[PDB]
Ligand binder design. Structure first.
Ligand code: MG
Length: 65
RNA sequence: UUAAGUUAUUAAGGGCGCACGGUGGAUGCCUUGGCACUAGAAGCCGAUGAAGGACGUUACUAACGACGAUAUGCUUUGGG
C-alpha cells in the first residue's frame, strides 16, 4: 500500500492497518521458518508497507505540533 | 703352435657440449593505488547525546559496503 492511499486513510485506520500488517508479516515469517513460504517477496512488501504507515502517522503527529 | 713386444674394447659412475622438460618469479609491458603540488571552497562536532564503536537489518547471510526494530531502507521535491 502506497503513501497516497495511506494519506486517504484516517489515523485510527492507520493504526488498525499497522496491526494487521504486523500480524501478516509474523505469519509469513512463521511459514518461512516451517518451510511453507514460496512467495518470499511478500515479506519485504509488507515490511515496506508498515514503514510507510508509520511514516505517514509520524508526519501527521508532526504537523499537529 | 710357442715366445717376445704392442695396442684396444669395458663406463659402475663422472666430465664437457647439446636437446627437451620441471621448479622459481627476475625482466618487459600494464594499473586498480600512491607521492608532491596549484587554484577555488571550507576550516569545527557534542547533553536536541559527539568522535569512535557493539549489536542487528536481506528469501537463503560467513564477510565488506549501506542501513537502524520504519534496518540491504520510509516520505517528499526536482533530475532521468
Ligand atoms: Mg520524482
Amino acid at each position: 500500500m502506497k503513501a497516497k492511499e495511506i494519506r486517504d486513510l484516517t489515523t485510527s485506520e492507520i493504526e488498525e492497518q499497522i496491526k494487521s500488517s504486523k500480524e501478516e508479516l509474523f505469519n509469513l515469517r512463521f511459514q518461512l521458518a516451517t518451510g511453507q513460504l514460496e512467495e518470499t517477496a511478500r515479506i519485504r512488501t509488507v515490511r515496506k508497507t508498515i514503514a510507510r504507515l508509520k511514516t505517514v502517522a509520524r508526519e501527521r503527529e508532526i504537523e499537529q505540533s
